[PDB]
Design a protein around this ligand. Structure first.
Ligand SMILES: [Zn+2]
Length: 128
């Protein structure tokens, strides 16, 4: 019994404290794979909350849903990650079934901003 996200953990022991909004991930990767689970659980509310203060204004309820509507999240596979005081960076691959049949994998590197000890998603794009 393992979590549906990059964590050798259960659902509760892993994503639970994050989705409960009770405990801070304290790590860029720890935040990322927990948010990934929220996408699969359509808890886009959690997503927005743990998004960068600047980027959070850019988010929308339906748009946040739009991704899961077309991309069925199968598995999350982290490649690398690093916390640097207040700046974080994580390279990953998100494997999802996009459409009726094809499994597509989104490989990119997301930067995270640390605010008040909590991690917030700043942005992510193709690995440079
Ligand atoms: Zn998890």
């Amino acid at each position: 019994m393992n979590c549906v996200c990059g964590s050798g953990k259960t659902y509760d022991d892993c994503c639970g404290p994050l989705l409960a909004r009770t405990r801070s991930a304290a790590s860029p990767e720890a935040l990322m794979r927990s948010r990934y689970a929220a996408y699969a659980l359509k808890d886009f509310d959690y997503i927005v909350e743990t998004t960068d203060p600047e980027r959070r204004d850019l988010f929308d309820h339906d748009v946040n849903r739009a991704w899961m509507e077309e991309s069925d999240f199968l598995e999350l596979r982290v490649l690398g990650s690093s916390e640097k005081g207040s700046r974080g960076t994580v390279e990953f691959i998100a494997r999802f079934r996009r459409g009726g049949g094809p499994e597509q994998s989104h490989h990119e590197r997301s930067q995270f901003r640390k605010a008040r000890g909590r991690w917030y998603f700043s942005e992510g794009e193709a690995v440079d």
